[PDB]
Amino acid sequence: PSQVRQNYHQDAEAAINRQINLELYASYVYLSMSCYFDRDDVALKNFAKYFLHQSHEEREHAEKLMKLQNQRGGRIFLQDIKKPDRDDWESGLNAMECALHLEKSVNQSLLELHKLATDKNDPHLCDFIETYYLSEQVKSIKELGDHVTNLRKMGAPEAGMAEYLFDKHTLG
Amino acid sequence: PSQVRQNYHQDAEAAINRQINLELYASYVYLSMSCYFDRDDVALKNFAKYFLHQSHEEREHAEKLMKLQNQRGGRIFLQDIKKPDRDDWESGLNAMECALHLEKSVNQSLLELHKLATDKNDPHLCDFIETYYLSEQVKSIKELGDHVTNLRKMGAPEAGMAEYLFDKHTLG
Amino acid sequence: PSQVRQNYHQDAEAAINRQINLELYASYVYLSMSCYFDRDDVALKNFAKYFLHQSHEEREHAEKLMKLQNQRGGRIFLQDIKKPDRDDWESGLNAMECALHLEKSVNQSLLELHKLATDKNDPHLCDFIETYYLSEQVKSIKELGDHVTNLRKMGAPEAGMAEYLFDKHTLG
Amino acid sequence: PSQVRQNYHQDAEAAINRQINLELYASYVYLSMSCYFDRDDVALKNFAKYFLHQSHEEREHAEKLMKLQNQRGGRIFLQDIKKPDRDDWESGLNAMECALHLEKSVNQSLLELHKLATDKNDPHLCDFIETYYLSEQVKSIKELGDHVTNLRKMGAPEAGMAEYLFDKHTLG
Ligand SMILES: [Fe+3]
Ligand SMILES: [Zn+2]
Ligand SMILES: [Zn+2]
Ligand SMILES: [Zn+2]
Ligand SMILES: [Zn+2]
């Protein structure tokens, strides 16, 4: 047992390892989306910039959980990062809808983690999740819902100027 | 009778109390509209910002009348602020049309108040209304009429890009 | 159901609507108190300034809950804002005592809301209340208790110079 | 008839001459009060400073009416400035009460003047009075009412420290 370990259940250590994998997976999905919008047959630079920013943010989320695991005296066990479900993301609207789905799935994972920390009476870990993860997920899910709403009303993907003008106005 | 009171008719005191209520009501209507445009299924940030600015302006109008009532030695009697007529304002165009209707109703209230101050030979109160209320209402009614004209010509609400591009160009 | 909604119970949505009404009511009570201290027969400018600051702060509290309701995919349903219990607040000491009573009643409402969010396993909403509401209420209740203590010891309201000198020293 | 005269009734010219005399009289009353508070047996420097400021302000009010009379092509006819009703103003509270009485009497004179300009269809003269005289009188009467309220509550003139502390806090 680590000299620093105190009130850190083996189940919490295991759940934090699963979450690190999921944040690294989310980072890979966003990178896949970023490089789709950089294709010459798609060519939406501000969609590509937006998803690359999200990819980097998710890597910072993963790295902060790795820091937490080490501060609490747990041990990081890394696993394969699975390839994303698509190479071709079809449209700006479809990628925003898939990003929304991914962010809600990551949020559900964190709520299951908070529930585990509550059941194991781990107040430091509960507060860590609330402070740096849950606040930020609610704000992300709302941003993506807003983007989806706006793109559907402008008539994306069938309206050719919808994603062009969204790329300049909302994402530019 | 207040030591400061001079040439302030009890009817004028009563009418200023009714106007305070109407400016506070207008503030509440604008706040209702502001929070409609912040819904994820509407998601027009600059429409929400515009109506929140109007909500704050109307609270400043109410507060200035409360200052007038106290300077003249009248007594403020507050009344319930009634809830707005809708929760769902339907579209950017509909909210602008409802705002236009509300601002004309507030203007008519002030013209009835000016007529009362003229009939009671209250020149200080007449000048107060002209200087800080009537000028400002004419300018508001014209701004809203302009917004409505522009949104109808762009084809709102059926044209999906009309309110999107109005939100960026006119309100951004 | 809203595309952004996740882990937000209908009871929590209803309770947040009741709290918005209570923060708007508190804003109206403070405005009533502010305009009492501006009467020429009361004439305590720094008491009026203090209560107007509180009125504005409570409107910011209400607006932040409206933002929370929209971020979580709930729907704001506004209700009438009831008129305050008095027009005449009697003295500086009495208004501070009534403000203390109001702030404890708002605090009890938030503790009932936290208990509901705990029972519905809503950690984002629990953390929101703790971070932006409960900390701030404890600090307000203590400030008002301090003011009341000081005014009673100086001999308010019977000692004429007590509220005058409190207005200059503590509130100036 | 003056080459510049247009729509200026002989009654309005006469009434403006009477008002010039009253503003010069008010200036003399305030100067009398200022020099009472500078006596070694009264010795309230900030009461003396306050009334000297009012004396100078009233001379500026008189001079602005003299400018108006000349702009409209009337002729200034000056009259004796009568001596004030007292040399000894008794107390800070009594002087503030006498100042309140004087300012209400000047205000009533201006309302009679506005009524005359309204009856003679002189809109330039009506607007002149509203803009530079009536606004300012309401604000003066309210300031003096506030001062009187505060001094009576602190227990002036019998409470020896009331006028001392008012001189430092309110007027300093
Ligand atoms: Fe002192
Ligand atoms: Zn993340
Ligand atoms: Zn208004
Ligand atoms: Zn509050
Ligand atoms: Zn004057």
Swiss-Prot record, chains A, B, C, D:
> Has the keyword Metal-binding been applied to this entry?
yes
Sequence positions that bind Fe cation 2:
E58, E103, Q137
Which InterPro entries does this one have? Ferritin (IPR001519), Ferritin-like (IPR012347), Ferritin-like_diiron (IPR009040), Ferritin-like_SF (IPR009078), Ferritin_CS (IPR014034), Ferritin_DPS_dom (IPR008331)
Question: Gene behind this chain?
Answer: Fth1
Name any one Pfam family assigned in the record.
Ferritin
Q: Which GO MF terms does the UniProt record name?
A: ferric iron binding; ferroxidase activity; identical protein binding; iron ion binding
List where in the cell it is found: Cytoplasm; Cytoplasmic vesicle, Autophagosome; Autolysosome
Q: Which GO terms describe its cellular component?
A: autolysosome; autophagosome; cytosol; endocytic vesicle lumen; extracellular region; membrane; mitochondrion
PANTHER family (alphabetical): FERRITIN (PTHR11431), FERRITIN HEAVY CHAIN (PTHR11431:SF37)
Transmembrane feature ranges? none
Q: Which reaction does it catalyse?
A: 4 Fe(2+) + O2 + 4 H(+) = 4 Fe(3+) + 2 H2O
Subunit info?
Oligomer of 24 subunits. There are two types of subunits: L (light) chain and H (heavy) chain. The major chain can be light or heavy, depending on the species and tissue type. The functional molecule forms a roughly spherical shell with a diameter of 12 nm and contains a central cavity into which the insoluble mineral iron core is deposited. Interacts with NCOA4; NCOA4 promotes targeting of the iron-binding ferritin complex to autolysosomes following starvation or iron depletion.
- Name the species this protein comes from: Mus musculus
Predominant subcellular localization, coarse grouping:
cytoplasm
**What name goes with this protein?**
Ferritin heavy chain
